[PDB]
Scaffold this active site. Structure first.
Site, PDB file in Angstrom:
ATOM      1  N   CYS A  30      -1.456  -9.364  -0.260  1.00  0.00           N
ATOM      2  CA  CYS A  30      -2.309  -7.737  -0.479  1.00  0.00           C
ATOM      3  C   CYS A  30      -1.331  -7.067   1.327  1.00  0.00           C
ATOM      4  O   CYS A  30      -0.885  -7.769   1.977  1.00  0.00           O
ATOM      5  CB  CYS A  30      -2.942  -7.440  -0.591  1.00  0.00           C
ATOM      6  SG  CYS A  30      -4.480  -6.156  -0.685  1.00  0.00           S
TER       7      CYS A  30
ATOM      8  N   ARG B 131      -1.047  -7.144  -4.674  1.00  0.00           N
ATOM      9  CA  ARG B 131      -1.268  -5.757  -5.075  1.00  0.00           C
ATOM     10  C   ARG B 131      -0.106  -4.858  -4.949  1.00  0.00           C
ATOM     11  O   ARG B 131       0.544  -5.090  -3.722  1.00  0.00           O
ATOM     12  CB  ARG B 131      -2.408  -5.764  -3.400  1.00  0.00           C
ATOM     13  CG  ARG B 131      -3.492  -6.373  -4.188  1.00  0.00           C
ATOM     14  CD  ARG B 131      -4.036  -5.243  -5.177  1.00  0.00           C
ATOM     15  NE  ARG B 131      -4.203  -3.839  -4.673  1.00  0.00           N
ATOM     16  CZ  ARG B 131      -4.464  -3.909  -3.133  1.00  0.00           C
ATOM     17  NH1 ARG B 131      -5.437  -4.242  -2.504  1.00  0.00           N
ATOM     18  NH2 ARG B 131      -4.613  -2.468  -2.590  1.00  0.00           N
TER      19      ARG B 131
ATOM     20  N   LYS C  43      -6.580 -14.585  -1.620  1.00  0.00           N
ATOM     21  CA  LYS C  43      -6.029 -13.275  -1.079  1.00  0.00           C
ATOM     22  C   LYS C  43      -5.731 -12.995  -0.061  1.00  0.00           C
ATOM     23  O   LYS C  43      -6.043 -13.105   1.437  1.00  0.00           O
ATOM     24  CB  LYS C  43      -7.142 -11.867  -1.264  1.00  0.00           C
ATOM     25  CG  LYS C  43      -7.269 -10.841  -1.316  1.00  0.00           C
ATOM     26  CD  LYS C  43      -7.592  -9.215  -1.959  1.00  0.00           C
ATOM     27  CE  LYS C  43      -8.117  -8.477  -1.501  1.00  0.00           C
ATOM     28  NZ  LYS C  43      -9.129  -7.670  -2.068  1.00  0.00           N
ATOM     29  N   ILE C  44      -4.266 -13.061   0.059  1.00  0.00           N
ATOM     30  CA  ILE C  44      -4.258 -12.853   1.570  1.00  0.00           C
ATOM     31  C   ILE C  44      -3.430 -11.793   2.129  1.00  0.00           C
ATOM     32  O   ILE C  44      -2.792 -11.248   1.299  1.00  0.00           O
ATOM     33  CB  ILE C  44      -3.323 -14.249   1.889  1.00  0.00           C
ATOM     34  CG1 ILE C  44      -1.995 -14.409   0.969  1.00  0.00           C
ATOM     35  CG2 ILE C  44      -3.557 -15.506   1.795  1.00  0.00           C
ATOM     36  CD1 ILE C  44      -0.731 -14.837   1.102  1.00  0.00           C
ATOM     37  N   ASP C  45      -4.168 -10.859   3.086  1.00  0.00           N
ATOM     38  CA  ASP C  45      -4.229  -9.253   3.283  1.00  0.00           C
ATOM     39  C   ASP C  45      -3.041  -9.292   4.916  1.00  0.00           C
ATOM     40  O   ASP C  45      -3.300 -10.096   5.387  1.00  0.00           O
ATOM     41  CB  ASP C  45      -5.504  -9.274   3.363  1.00  0.00           C
ATOM     42  CG  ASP C  45      -5.484  -7.656   2.263  1.00  0.00           C
ATOM     43  OD1 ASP C  45      -4.003  -7.058   2.816  1.00  0.00           O
ATOM     44  OD2 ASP C  45      -6.804  -7.092   2.557  1.00  0.00           O
TER      45      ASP C  45
ATOM     46  N   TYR D 177     -14.960  -3.931  -3.332  1.00  0.00           N
ATOM     47  CA  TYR D 177     -15.194  -2.340  -4.130  1.00  0.00           C
ATOM     48  C   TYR D 177     -17.065  -1.466  -4.646  1.00  0.00           C
ATOM     49  O   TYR D 177     -16.899  -0.689  -5.093  1.00  0.00           O
ATOM     50  CB  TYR D 177     -13.530  -2.202  -4.910  1.00  0.00           C
ATOM     51  CG  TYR D 177     -12.585  -2.113  -4.548  1.00  0.00           C
ATOM     52  CD1 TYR D 177     -11.833  -1.153  -3.988  1.00  0.00           C
ATOM     53  CD2 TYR D 177     -12.027  -3.709  -5.046  1.00  0.00           C
ATOM     54  CE1 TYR D 177     -10.921  -0.990  -2.974  1.00  0.00           C
ATOM     55  CE2 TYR D 177     -10.622  -3.267  -4.397  1.00  0.00           C
ATOM     56  CZ  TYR D 177      -9.745  -2.436  -3.559  1.00  0.00           C
ATOM     57  OH  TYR D 177      -8.690  -2.592  -2.921  1.00  0.00           O
TER      58      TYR D 177
ATOM     59  N   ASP E 155      -5.171   0.830  -2.356  1.00  0.00           N
ATOM     60  CA  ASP E 155      -6.647   0.808  -2.100  1.00  0.00           C
ATOM     61  C   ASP E 155      -7.290   1.554  -3.339  1.00  0.00           C
ATOM     62  O   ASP E 155      -7.145   3.043  -3.445  1.00  0.00           O
ATOM     63  CB  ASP E 155      -7.247   0.505  -1.317  1.00  0.00           C
ATOM     64  CG  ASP E 155      -7.425  -0.502   0.131  1.00  0.00           C
ATOM     65  OD1 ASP E 155      -6.700  -1.423   0.024  1.00  0.00           O
ATOM     66  OD2 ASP E 155      -8.561  -0.695   0.323  1.00  0.00           O
TER      67      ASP E 155
ATOM     68  N   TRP F 274       0.635  -1.645   0.431  1.00  0.00           N
ATOM     69  CA  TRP F 274       0.144   0.061   0.588  1.00  0.00           C
ATOM     70  C   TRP F 274       0.660   0.873   0.191  1.00  0.00           C
ATOM     71  O   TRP F 274       0.364   2.588  -0.133  1.00  0.00           O
ATOM     72  CB  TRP F 274      -1.106   0.302   0.641  1.00  0.00           C
ATOM     73  CG  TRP F 274      -2.238  -1.227   1.252  1.00  0.00           C
ATOM     74  CD1 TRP F 274      -2.282  -1.769   0.101  1.00  0.00           C
ATOM     75  CD2 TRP F 274      -2.349  -1.983   2.335  1.00  0.00           C
ATOM     76  NE1 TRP F 274      -3.162  -2.934   0.838  1.00  0.00           N
ATOM     77  CE2 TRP F 274      -3.086  -2.815   2.398  1.00  0.00           C
ATOM     78  CE3 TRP F 274      -1.909  -1.791   4.097  1.00  0.00           C
ATOM     79  CZ2 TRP F 274      -3.932  -3.904   2.674  1.00  0.00           C
ATOM     80  CZ3 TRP F 274      -2.663  -2.431   4.896  1.00  0.00           C
ATOM     81  CH2 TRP F 274      -3.766  -3.741   4.310  1.00  0.00           C
TER      82      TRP F 274
ATOM     83  N   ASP G  68     -14.646 -11.081  -0.512  1.00  0.00           N
ATOM     84  CA  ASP G  68     -13.983 -10.916  -0.013  1.00  0.00           C
ATOM     85  C   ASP G  68     -14.204  -9.838   1.798  1.00  0.00           C
ATOM     86  O   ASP G  68     -15.000 -11.164   2.201  1.00  0.00           O
ATOM     87  CB  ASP G  68     -13.070  -9.004  -0.362  1.00  0.00           C
ATOM     88  CG  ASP G  68     -12.200  -8.621  -0.116  1.00  0.00           C
ATOM     89  OD1 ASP G  68     -12.356  -7.772   0.469  1.00  0.00           O
ATOM     90  OD2 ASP G  68     -11.442  -8.583  -1.214  1.00  0.00           O
ATOM     91  N   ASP G  69     -13.791  -9.407   2.501  1.00  0.00           N
ATOM     92  CA  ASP G  69     -13.444  -9.128   3.645  1.00  0.00           C
ATOM     93  C   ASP G  69     -15.336  -8.894   4.097  1.00  0.00           C
ATOM     94  O   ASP G  69     -15.828  -7.796   3.230  1.00  0.00           O
ATOM     95  CB  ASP G  69     -13.223  -8.053   3.982  1.00  0.00           C
ATOM     96  CG  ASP G  69     -12.923  -7.776   5.623  1.00  0.00           C
ATOM     97  OD1 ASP G  69     -13.996  -8.269   6.396  1.00  0.00           O
ATOM     98  OD2 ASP G  69     -12.484  -6.903   6.451  1.00  0.00           O
TER      99      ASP G  69
END
Length: 526
Positions: free
Chosen positions: A369, A384, A326-328, A192, A388, A66, A221-222
């Site tokens: 991510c 990523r 997707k591992i964040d 999103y 975002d 990010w 997603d989350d």
């Protein structure tokens, strides 16, 4: 011009014996420059590898997804105030950022690239200390009774800065056996449009609609999870995690799922059951970050119990049919602090992601991510590489890693070079709906076509019932721009204007010129 480990630059083989540590190293000629590599033992702490005169203008790089990658005036740096809720996204060595300009992994000036090829044990960074550029390897007070390898450092010089960055990236890929799939997935992400208000009801609606779109992967997603750490328990609307996969596969999609696997909230069942599983400060759980209005702790990835739990978790997701992960918030697993083993925070991080990889198997796609970059090479398939994106341009949003389309795009441009070398770059989702967005058609096209020219991943995130002819058009056009070898021609640009070419796309040779200030583009297709 330069000191290597304290002494004047010299080609050859060398030893530096200090009180506390010893390093054996070689300064060797490679294509377009030099490579410093070797091995070190003792307690190197924060180890100076190179010193030289800071240039005036430098492309610098945050260590994780990010964070910004941008050109900066080296001599008029003032320390940022670090948001204490997000301390370690800014820096893994925040004492430095508090005083000096910092760059993780690499730095570039016009005609020169300095870059480390790996972060297996140390965190490699550069600081500007009083007019000097200093490359360091940080070992976080870890001691080594015998030799372990240095993170090699390269110094490349040539007029062509882009070529140099591309070169650097190739060497990173080989040093770390980068995973670069021949096939790039397409898909749909929930985040999103719906953010934390996603329901299974709306999910099934889009799942029906997704059939009219060129998507392979359907990714939740989350929103589905009970808590951060409690990944197999759903809240609200949502069924079984097993059921959701089943329903998604039944509909002809690869199911994908979002986790923050290294993170556990103070309210989680797993933290409640296993408070000793986390990274500590003075014996007490150390807050890795604050999010979802809770304190979040980091898993101690040195502990075998923690790794078994991660193994079990991702083994069972795989069993249920999830093949896209997707591992964040991965930075959490690499926070400085007390762990069971006396290893680096970086060694621990790698143990963690290596475990996830082994659990999900070779035919699973892993998208990193919020992640340390260099340490994840050879393990993630996609990454990523920016903050975002958003359903607005974000001119009211500063360059401080919060969500904004403009800054997301900026990073996709400035880190273009890692793509197809480190991994597949994920520029974040295309947002192509005609309603419930502040984005103009111009802006949507600009974002999308840049990503296509960059050959990046194309994942759409919309309520698909709000995507109509224009958005459907833009998606199909973007996919026609893919397949080339891209280059950002003027990577050292300071005014957010870029000329990006790509050779051998599905549409031939292409060029997009973009102005992220005026939100304008011109695209030629030869």
């Amino acid at each position: 011009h330069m000191e290597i480990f304290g002494k004047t630059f010299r080609e050859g083989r060398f030893v530096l014996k200090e009180k506390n540590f010893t390093v054996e190293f070689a300064v060797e000629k490679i294509h377009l420059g030099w490579k410093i590599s070797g091995r070190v033992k003792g307690s190197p702490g924060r180890l100076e590898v190179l010193r030289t005169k800071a240039p005036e203008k430098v492309l610098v790089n945050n260590w994780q997804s990010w964070g910004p990658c941008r050109v900066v005036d080296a001599f008029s740096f003032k320390p940022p105030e670090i948001d204490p809720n997000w301390r370690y996204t800014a820096s893994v060595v925040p004492d430095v950022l508090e005083r000096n300009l910092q760059s993780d992994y690499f730095v570039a000036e016009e005609g020169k690239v300095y870059g480390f090829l790996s972060s297996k044990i140390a965190h490699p960074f550069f600081a500007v200390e009083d007019g000097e550029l200093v490359a360091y390897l940080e070992y976080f007070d870890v001691e080594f009774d015998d030799f372990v390898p240095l993170e090699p450092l390269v110094v490349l010089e040539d007029p062509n800065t882009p070529l140099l960055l591309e070169k650097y990236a190739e060497l990173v890929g080989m040093e770390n056996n980068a995973r670069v799939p021949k096939h790039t997935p397409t898909g749909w992400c929930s985040w999103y449009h719906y953010f934390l208000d996603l329901t299974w009801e709306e999910t099934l609606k889009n799942l029906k609609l997704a059939k009219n779109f060129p998507f392979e992967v359907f990714q939740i997603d989350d929103a589905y999870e009970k808590d951060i750490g409690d990944w197999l328990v759903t809240r609200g609307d949502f069924p079984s995690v097993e059921e959701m996969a089943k329903v998604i596969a039944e509909n002809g999609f690869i199911p994908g799922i979002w986790t923050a696997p290294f993170s556990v909230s103070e309210t989680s069942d797993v933290f409640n059951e296993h408070p000793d599983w986390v990274v500590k400060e003075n014996g007490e759980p150390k807050m890795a970050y604050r999010n979802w209005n809770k304190k979040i702790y980091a898993l101690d990835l040195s502990k075998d119990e923690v790794l078994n739990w991660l193994f079990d978790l991702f083994s069972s997701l795989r069993k249920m049919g999830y093949r896209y992960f997707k591992i964040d918030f991965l930075f959490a697993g690499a926070v400085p602090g007390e762990r069971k083993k006396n290893i680096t925070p970086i060694q621990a991080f790698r143990k963690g992601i290596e475990t996830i990889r082994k659990a999900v198997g070779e035919d699973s796609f892993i998208l990193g991510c919020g992640s340390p970059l260099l340490p994840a090479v050879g393990c993630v398939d996609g990454m990523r590489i920016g903050p975002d994106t958003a359903p607005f341009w974000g001119e009211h949003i500063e360059d401080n890693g919060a969500p904004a389309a403009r800054w997301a795009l900026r990073n996709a441009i400035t880190r273009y070079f890692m793509h197809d070398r480190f991994w597949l770059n994920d520029p974040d989702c295309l947002i192509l709906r005609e309603e419930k967005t502040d984005l103009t058609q111009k802006e949507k096209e600009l974002y999308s076509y840049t990503c296509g020219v960059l050959d990046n991943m194309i994942i759409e995130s919309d309520d698909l019932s709000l995507v109509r002819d224009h958005g459907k058009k833009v998606l199909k056009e973007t996919l026609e721009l893919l397949g080339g070898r891209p280059r950002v021609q003027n990577i050292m640009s300071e005014d957010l204007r870029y000329e990006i070419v790509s050779s051998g796309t599905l549409s031939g040779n292409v060029k997009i010129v973009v102005d992220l200030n005026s939100r304008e583009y011109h695209l030629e297709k030869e």
